[PDB]
Amino acid sequence: MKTGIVNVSSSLNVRSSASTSSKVIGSLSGNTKVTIVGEEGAFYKIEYKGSHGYVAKEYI
């Protein structure tokens, strides 16, 4: 139930998987609400903008 808050930094690149080679695919907004839904590697799974992208958990 409890959601996580994205670290209101200044910039954050969203990948397509727990791989850097995946490259960028979209940009997420800080302070955005995301209902976590699983995790893999040094990244977590989320669902926003009707789409899904991986994000670092260490930064959050």
Q: Which residues does residue 26 pair with via DSSP β-bridges, in sequence order? A: 14
Q: Which domains does the chain have, with CATH numbers?
A: 1-60 (2.30.30.40)
Alpha carbons 16 and 40: distance in angstroms, whole number: 12
- The answer to whether residues 37 and 51 touch, using CB atoms and an 8 Å cutoff, is no
Q: Strand 54-56 relative to strand 33-34: parallel, antiparallel, unpaired?
A: unpaired
Alpha carbons 50 and 40: distance in angstroms, whole number: 20
Angle at 4 between CA 47 and CA 2, to 5 degrees: 95
49 to each of 1, 13, 28, 29, 45, how far by Cα in Å?
Answer: 19, 15, 9, 10, 13
Method: NMR
Neighbours of 37 (CB within 10 A): 10
**DSSP letter string over the chain?**
-PPEE----S--EEBSSS-GGG---EEPPTT-EE----EETTEEE--BTTB--EEESS--
Name 52's Cβ contacts closer than 8 Å, sequence gap at least 6: 45, 46
Alpha carbons 3 and 18: distance in angstroms, whole number: 21
